[PDB]
Amino acid sequence: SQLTKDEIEEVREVFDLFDFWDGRDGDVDAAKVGDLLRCLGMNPTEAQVHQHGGTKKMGEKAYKLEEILPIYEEMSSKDTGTAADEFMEAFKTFDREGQGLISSAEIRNVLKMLGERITEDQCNDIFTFCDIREDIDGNIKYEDLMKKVMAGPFPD
């Protein structure tokens, strides 16, 4: 048991990116373990990050490529990473009329006021990015938002 060679090369290539931007020295700051992992394609929750070594401020702890791997690996043991399924039921909780439409006001409210909060900025951006509009009061197709999100900033 363990990762594979290619799997490593991949963890690596990303690893390099990160250590690069903070001074090619074989160390990536912990404050970026989250982001690192995401660039690997995973979507960790903040609690998931801290529980795996992540720290908030920048000058606390560093990691070598040999240290991230097991982390990346472990981090991968979890499987409630979330399915479209879960996102739907979830959203539905807010579907006042069961059409698939939610007042943009609310979704954001959710994404901002709830769960691991999100920034005002972060909300706008994601919305601008997956090109999701709101009609008169033929608001936002949450499914749209969902799919697009799970689709990646670089579709094709």
Binding site: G34, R38, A83, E86, A90, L111, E116, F129, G152, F154
Partner: protein, 808 residues
């Protein structure tokens, strides 16, 4: 909520969507919020702080006080989705605390009506509310309960549907005290059955024709009880009739269990029936003299035993409406006399004194005698003769004169009682004639008014007497629930593991009726001259102490705090009784000779008395027995009226008071039985829309069968199969199931939201990835192109072809 939460009428019945959604989503944590006992308002909502042994510490939430409550005192409060809940049957936590909430909160939100099982609770609002519009009526016209919000017309309408539908008489039992507006209701229920009779398609109103007589009866059937200014000491069944077309076709009134005893006995802070006192007021002096009395109530041992007047009662005025009402029902100002006179005659029978020679009693006057002798229309001599010394038979006729003083005193009382009874029966008969302005009756829907369960500081033979009844009524209820539920399961193919619910009260009940029972014993112990209160106790103790869980024994209280002699276990809790004068009160012997003799002169008198030596219990037994045979024949419907506060003031809610009512109500007894079963039931579809989130799956919410999901959702949460059963259309749950599910949803949702957020950061950052990459190339190119430059800025040569070329 049903129909349009926004339709104007439903302001006091529904709860506007926006106002609901709002009230339904409030802060909550099934892990620490809770119901907790509160000395001022019964129970209060709280939050648990920490735990240790059988001692939990908690924090309230309005007067956030840290209290140290025990463990079997932490009431699990219901999660939000249940606020303003419409049918307490649906609560997932059916504890007292919780039953208080759903009711209070709704009352404090202007809502009075609430269902709790077959029960239709109604709290007095103490203010006129729209609620009874002939516009609304159509709204409830033919809708099955579930279709409309609470409200009294539903219960009454269906009540109707069932009549015409199953084709069998219907009864409506409403409970509640004084300011419960119990009256109003019954009134309004009569109104309804009316409006619907002429609502098919082509000299006073029903309501009025009946509410018309209620004053005369109240005059003879009510009075002040320790805990109530106006207490009907009888049971009235107002039967409203219908014809094959659901057509109203007439009415009539049956009456059960009139408290005879009251005519000759008063409990300090109580009072004989109202009519006695009324007669003796500055309103119709003439009569006071026709009657042979002086407007001084206190001067009659049959009336002064208790109090004189009550607070907030202007006798006169009543003696007024009464006489005025006597003419609406319209009956001879002469009969009206006889009736009164009779009443008065009762005032002198309590005066007649006696004495004895050796062991034979004789008069100690002759004025009272002739007074009664006359008022009745018989000859004193003979009376006193047949009173002090009568004559009977074998084949020859001996002077059964065995009489003595203790035997006449009892004897005279009896007469009065009997007089009072025949009288009342009569009075009723006549009002029925007032009503019989009919054609032809086929069915009926009656409405039963009966004194509710009683519990005082001092409980006596009277109290047992009512409880006995009430206890036979709760059984009536429980039986009903049983049958129905049993159907409700078969309908959903669920396995039925339950012995009839009424059986739960059979115990107590039996400890009353059956040979060697409380009453029976009392009876035998009555036929023994030297029988004393102690000689009775012993026999009870002898016969039941350790032998029956139901019969128990209390322990001496204060000094004045009356001595108790034994307690029984009534659905309403544990009541403790005092044996004091039972031996006395219970004797109600008939003196034959007095009947035949009393079968002379004066029109009514003839009639009345013109239709062994027993007791009251034997009687009480006979009436109850009858009343029930009458009840079990009908399809019942139960309304529970409720006083919200001692001080007739809207919006308020006296915890203890409400609760107490609920226990006597049966409301709490239903929930008890509800508890032992699967109270909560869900259509698969409703279950689907609510917890899928818990075990989501790729199949579109549209092609997914409810049963399956629901099923598969539980298997997934590994739920003790013992907590629920899968019906043909619903899923039955036990106590607190949904409570958990709800909290796991709230649990899941949040997680699932942190996640979407997670995938968001994944796109948000993964998008920068590319940028950061491009910009690596750049920082490199520079960073390295700059260095090779730093080497060269000083490399002689470098300089050269940096000159040699712009010069080519």
């Amino acid at each position: 909520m049903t129909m349009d939460f926004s339709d104007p009428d439903m302001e006091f019945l529904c709860l506007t969507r926006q106002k609901l959604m709002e009230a339904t989503s409030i802060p909550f944590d099934g892990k620490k919020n809770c119901w907790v006992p509160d000395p001022d308002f019964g129970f209060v909502g709280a939050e648990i702080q920490s735990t240790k042994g059988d001692e939990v510490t908690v924090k309230t939430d309005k007067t956030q006080e840290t209290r140290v409550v025990k463990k079997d005192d932490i009431g699990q409060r219901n999660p939000p989705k249940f606020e303003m809940n419409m049918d307490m049957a649906n609560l997932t936590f059916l504890n007292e605390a919780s039953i208080l909430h759903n009711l209070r909160s709704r009352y404090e939100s202007g809502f009075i009506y609430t269902y709790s099982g077959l029960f239709c609770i109604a709290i007095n609002p103490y203010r006129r509310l729209p609620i009874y519009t002939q516009g609304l009526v159509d709204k409830y016209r033919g809708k099955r309960r579930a279709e409309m919000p609470p409200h009294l017309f539903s219960i009454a309408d269906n009540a109707y549907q069932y009549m015409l539908q199953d084709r069998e008489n219907q009864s409506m039992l409403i409970t509640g005290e004084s300011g419960a507006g119990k009256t109003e209701n019954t009134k309004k229920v009569i109104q309804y059955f009316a409006l619907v009779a002429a609502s098919l398609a082509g000299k006073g109103t029903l309501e009025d024709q009946i509410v018309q007589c209620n004053p005369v009866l109240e005059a003879y059937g009510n009075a002040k009880t320790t805990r109530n200014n106006n207490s009907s000491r009888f049971g009235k069944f107002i039967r409203i009739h219908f014809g094959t077309q659901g057509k109203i076709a007439g009415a009539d009134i049956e009456t059960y269990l009139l408290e005879k005893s009251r005519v000759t006995y008063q409990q300090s802070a109580e009072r004989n029936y109202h009519i006695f006192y009324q007669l003796l007021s500055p309103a119709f002096p003439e009569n006071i003299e026709k009657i042979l009395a002086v407007p001084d109530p206190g001067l009659y041992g049959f009336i002064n035993q208790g109090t004189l007047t009550v607070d907030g009662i202007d006798d006169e005025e009543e003696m007024g409406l009464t006489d005025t009402a006597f003419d609406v029902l319209g009956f001879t100002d002469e009969e009206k006399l006889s009736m009164y006179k009779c009443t008065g005659c009762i005032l002198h029978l309590g005066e007649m004194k006696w004495k004895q020679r050796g062991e034979q009693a004789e008069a100690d006057g002759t004025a009272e005698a002739e007074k009664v002798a006359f008022l009745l229309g018989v000859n004193a001599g003979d009376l006193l003769k047949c009173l002090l010394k009568p004559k009977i038979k074998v084949g020859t006729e001996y002077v059964t004169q065995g009489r003595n003083k203790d035997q006449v005193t009892n004897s005279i009382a009896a007469l009065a009682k009997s007089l009072y009874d025949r009288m009342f029966n009569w009075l009723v008969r006549r009002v029925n004639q007032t009503l019989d302005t009919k054609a032809k009756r086929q069915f009926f829907i009656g409405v039963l008014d009966i004194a509710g369960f009683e519990i005082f500081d001092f409980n006596s033979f009277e109290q047992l007497c009512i409880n006995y009844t009430n206890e036979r009524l709760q059984q009536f209820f429980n039986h009903h629930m049983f049958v129905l539920e049993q159907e409700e399961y078969k309908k959903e193919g669920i396995v039925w593991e339950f012995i009839d619910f009424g059986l739960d009260l059979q115990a107590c009940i039996e400890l009353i009726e059956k040979p060697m029972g409380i009453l029976s014993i009392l009876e035998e112990e009555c036929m023994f001259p030297k029988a004393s209160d102690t000689s009775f106790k012993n026999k009870l103790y002898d016969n039941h102490l350790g032998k029956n869980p139901m019969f128990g024994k209390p322990k001496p209280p204060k000094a004045g705090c009356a001595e108790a002699h034994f307690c029984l276990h009534h659905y309403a809790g544990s009541v403790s009784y005092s044996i004091a004068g039972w031996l006395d009160k219970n004797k109600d012997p008939i003196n034959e000779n007095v009947v035949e003799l009393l079968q002379n002169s004066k029109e009514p008198i003839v009639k009345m008395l013109f239709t062994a030596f027993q007791t009251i219990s034997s009687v009480h037994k006979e009436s109850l027995n009858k009343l029930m045979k009458n009840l079990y024949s009908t399809h019942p419907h139960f309304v529970r009226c409720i006083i919200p506060n001692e001080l007739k003031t809207p919006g308020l809610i006296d915890a203890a008071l409400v609760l107490h009512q609920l226990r006597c109500n049966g409301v709490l007894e239903g929930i008890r039985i509800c508890r032992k079963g699967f109270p909560n039931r869900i259509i698969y579809s409703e279950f689907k829309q609510r917890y899928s989130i818990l075990a989501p799956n790729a199949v579109p919410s549209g092609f997914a069968d409810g049963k399956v999901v629901t099923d598969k959702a539980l298997s997934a949460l590994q739920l003790d199969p013992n907590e629920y059963r899968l019906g043909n259309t619903k899923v039955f749950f036990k106590a607190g199931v949904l409570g958990m599910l709800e909290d796991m949803r709230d649990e899941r949702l949040s997680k699932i939201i942190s996640m979407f957020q997670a995938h968001i950061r994944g796109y948000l950052m993964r998008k920068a990835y590319k940028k950061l990459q491009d910009q690596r190339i750049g920082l490199t190119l520079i960073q390295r192109n700059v260095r090779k430059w730093l080497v060269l800025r000083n490399w002689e040569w470098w300089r050269l072809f940096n000159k040699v070329k712009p010069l080519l």
